[PDB]
Design an enzyme around this catalytic site. Structure first.
Site, mmCIF file in Angstrom:
data_model
loop_
_atom_site.group_PDB
_atom_site.id
_atom_site.type_symbol
_atom_site.label_atom_id
_atom_site.label_comp_id
_atom_site.label_asym_id
_atom_site.label_seq_id
_atom_site.Cartn_x
_atom_site.Cartn_y
_atom_site.Cartn_z
ATOM 1 N N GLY A 194 72.225 47.528 54.668
ATOM 2 C CA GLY A 194 73.248 47.499 55.750
ATOM 3 C C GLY A 194 72.931 48.185 57.021
ATOM 4 O O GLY A 194 73.863 48.447 57.742
ATOM 5 N N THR A 209 67.576 42.982 56.344
ATOM 6 C CA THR A 209 68.201 41.833 57.006
ATOM 7 C C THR A 209 68.222 42.054 58.523
ATOM 8 O O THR A 209 67.948 41.135 59.253
ATOM 9 C CB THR A 209 69.662 41.727 56.505
ATOM 10 O OG1 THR A 209 69.640 41.432 55.094
ATOM 11 C CG2 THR A 209 70.399 40.639 57.207
ATOM 12 N N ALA A 243 61.009 46.372 51.859
ATOM 13 C CA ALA A 243 60.099 45.533 51.275
ATOM 14 C C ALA A 243 60.606 44.109 51.273
ATOM 15 O O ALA A 243 61.757 43.813 50.993
ATOM 16 C CB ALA A 243 59.740 45.982 49.845
ATOM 17 N N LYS A 291 54.848 43.820 51.179
ATOM 18 C CA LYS A 291 55.601 42.978 50.297
ATOM 19 C C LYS A 291 55.306 43.270 48.823
ATOM 20 O O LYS A 291 54.151 43.300 48.436
ATOM 21 C CB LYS A 291 55.190 41.549 50.616
ATOM 22 C CG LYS A 291 55.786 40.499 49.713
ATOM 23 C CD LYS A 291 57.302 40.229 49.747
ATOM 24 C CE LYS A 291 57.891 39.394 48.563
ATOM 25 N NZ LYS A 291 59.448 39.181 48.441
ATOM 26 N N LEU A 314 59.709 35.910 44.890
ATOM 27 C CA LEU A 314 58.601 36.805 45.110
ATOM 28 C C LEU A 314 57.337 36.054 45.607
ATOM 29 O O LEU A 314 56.236 36.252 45.063
ATOM 30 C CB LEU A 314 58.283 37.645 43.874
ATOM 31 C CG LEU A 314 57.425 38.883 44.268
ATOM 32 C CD1 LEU A 314 58.218 40.068 44.778
ATOM 33 C CD2 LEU A 314 56.498 39.257 43.185
ATOM 34 N N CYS A 343 63.987 43.898 39.388
ATOM 35 C CA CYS A 343 63.107 42.836 39.162
ATOM 36 C C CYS A 343 63.117 42.184 37.712
ATOM 37 O O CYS A 343 63.229 42.873 36.743
ATOM 38 C CB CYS A 343 61.800 43.552 39.191
ATOM 39 S SG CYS A 343 60.367 42.534 38.946
#
Ligand SMILES: Cc1cc2nc3c(=O)[nH]c(=O)nc-3n(C[C@H](O)[C@H](O)[C@H](O)COP(=O)(O)O)c2cc1C
Ligand SMILES: Cc1cc2nc3c(=O)[nH]c(=O)nc-3n(C[C@H](O)[C@H](O)[C@H](O)COP(=O)(O)O)c2cc1C
Ligand SMILES: O=C(O)c1[nH]c(=O)[nH]c(=O)c1CCc1cccc2ccccc12
Ligand SMILES: O=C(O)c1[nH]c(=O)[nH]c(=O)c1CCc1cccc2ccccc12
Lengths: 313, 313
Positions: free
Chosen positions: B251, B273, B20, B44, B72, B131
């Site tokens: 990762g 990432t 996400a 998202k 966000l 969050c």
């Protein structure tokens, strides 16, 4: 140009030292660290009694860092105190002694005996707050009320300036709470940020196995994995504890990495995994690399840049 | 030999999906993810109202991973719900919709309106607990009481199986407590481990500056930095939540990294990432890499090795 500095009423040739637990458990280790080019040394965190620690393998290293669940193997407090009192050569560099009792009472017992040696010899206490807590609770430094009790009891029993070794935090509210606890204690004169990143898990693809035996392969992470965590904690506590020193530990393999820790606020810079991997010759390399970066930038002193990391806008 | 999975009453061609926040904010992004070779996609994390997010730069990536404090940014719940209800092609792959309201009431409101679309179209809810709630308090999943409240209220409001996105934990006591909370809630069918490693700090040595603008440079870490933390959390929750699925996130850059997640217990494997850096072509690479490891090892299906990480003695 030289890296000599003065902190805690001691003179240091340079800001580098070992991280507690690395190259510091035995008399041989301590003599080896004393013979090195490091600016200081710290002894292995100890208990009142000797410990064998956990079964092997209990440490492993990889290109990006290390994992360990040592189980606090150490020669016991009496050994470390003897080293501080009778064996260490204070003319070579300052000594820190790390204590990590299994209860507040054990810590208090140990610090009451350390205090006279601290007065006599100038050994400096580092209290490891990643020690175990009462049932069902996380490590002491993750239990803010426990941490407050430990520090009250130690401050009272010890009565002299000391430091604390902290685990990493990952939440800004936690930074605020932890720093507020530490700032209640005027004898806490340095904060070392950070201990290993807790309870990671390294798995070998070929063997399909974990790589350390204790705790089903879970252990604390150090090295390259943890540099941005380390920096965050150094800076967070640098900003929140203006009347204390911050010592950086985590992810240092180069003078560039040391430079970053000092930009973030570090006074001393501690070297764990990379020292375990490269050996004590690393200190000469780190000094030369740090002075090289300083020279390229025009900095003559550490004070010119310590804590001076720039923010955007 | 095959990467197929059947879980949550859906069929997945392979375990790979976006994490996400990555390649999933706009209709264009969602169409891109849908066209890719991934086995699923997640939208998202959204709020009731659209958000612009924080000032730029707010994400940066480096060889070992990334840092972000995005704030966000999102198109609002009504956009994502429209995508799930009217735009998404379910014959291509399953869809998860991530929600991350700023209060328990905001979440309740969203999930009440998602429920009918979940029932009719089979979109799967992922609730982001990693969050903020009240500023000065920890994130929701670092406040066990708040976590419990959120899960109670969302379970009541939604009334359908859902999953939760969890921050990493670093203490065994926290793994125990967090999984105990989750296990109170039978509608929590999957647990995604992990969100970013919070509030790290990247500093650029040349410029002597932080690299993102919000939060004085502090932000969540992803990528190579966090793989052993991610594995630890996957495995910890895998062990502690035997009636739930665990999805792994953190990762993943290679089929080997995926393989490790799956050994640890992961069902789906999310890519953040590395996806952000390489783009959606990564999915074909990951699929191929993972099939290659399975072929070398003689594994025909993912269940043959899922959760089968070996421990020592
Ligand atoms: C084998 C080993 C043993 C350690 N034992 C201790 C210890 O006794 N006391 C302590 O404060 N930290 C201990 N640590 C943590 C290190 O002092 C250091 O905080 C951590 O490794 C992060 O630094 P690095 O990234 O340079 O490794 C130990 C680390 C390792 C690798
Ligand atoms: C730019 C960016 C935005 C993100 N936004 C969200 C989000 O909206 N919801 C969420 O659950 N996680 C979010 N994450 C966290 C990722 O989903 C993922 O948990 C984290 O990046 C670790 O995975 P990785 O190592 O593959 O990056 C975001 C990550 C990045 C890099
Ligand atoms: O020796 C350790 O495993 C160790 N490794 C680290 O990376 N950091 C540390 O601080 C420690 C020692 C933490 C510790 C402190 C006090 C008692 C302990 C007993 C069992 C296991 C660990 C104990
Ligand atoms: O938007 C983000 O910063 C973000 N980045 C992540 O890597 N993971 C996440 O889950 C999020 C969103 C949750 C979040 C995480 C950290 C700070 C936030 C500040 C405002 C609103 C949401 C915040």
């Amino acid at each position: 140009m030289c890296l000599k500095l003065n902190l805690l009423d001691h003179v240091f040739a340079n800001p580098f030292m070992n991280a507690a637990g690395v190259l510091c458990s035995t008399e041989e280790d301590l003599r080896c660290m004393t013979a090195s080019s490091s600016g200081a040394l710290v002894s292995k965190s100890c208990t009142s009694a000797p410990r064998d620690g956990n079964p092997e393998p209990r440490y492993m290293a990889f290109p990006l860092g290390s994992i360990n669940s040592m189980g606090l193997p150490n020669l016991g407090f009496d050994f470390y105190l003897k080293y501080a009192s009778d064996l260490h050569d204070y003319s070579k560099k300052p000594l820190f002694l790390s204590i990590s009792g299994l209860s507040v009472e054990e810590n208090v017992a140990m610090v009451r005996r350390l205090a006279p040696v601290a007065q006599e010899k100038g050994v400096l206490l580092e209290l490891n707050l990643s020690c175990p807590n009462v049932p069902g609770k996380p490590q002491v430094a993750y239990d803010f009320e426990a941490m407050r009790t430990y520090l009250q009891q130690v401050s009272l029993a010890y009565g002299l300036p000391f430091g604390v070794k902290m685990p990493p935090y990952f939440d800004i509210a936690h930074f605020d709470t932890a720093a507020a606890v530490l700032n209640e204690f005027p004898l806490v004169k340095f904060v070392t940020c950070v201990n290993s990143v807790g309870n990671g898990l390294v798995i070998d693809a070929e063997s399909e196995s974990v790589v350390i035996k204790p705790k089903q392969g879970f252990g604390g992470l150090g090295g390259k994995y943890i540099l941005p965590t380390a920096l965050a904690n150094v800076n967070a506590f640098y900003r929140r504890c203006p009347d204390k020193l911050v010592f950086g530990c985590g992810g240092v393999y180069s003078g560039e990495d040391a430079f970053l820790h000092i930009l973030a606020g570090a006074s001393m810079v501690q070297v764990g995994t990379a020292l375990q991997e490269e050996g004590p010759g690393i200190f000469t390399r780190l000094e030369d690399e740090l002075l090289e970066i300083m020279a390229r930038k025009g900095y003559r002193t550490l004070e010119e840049f310590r804590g001076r990391v720039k923010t955007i806008e």
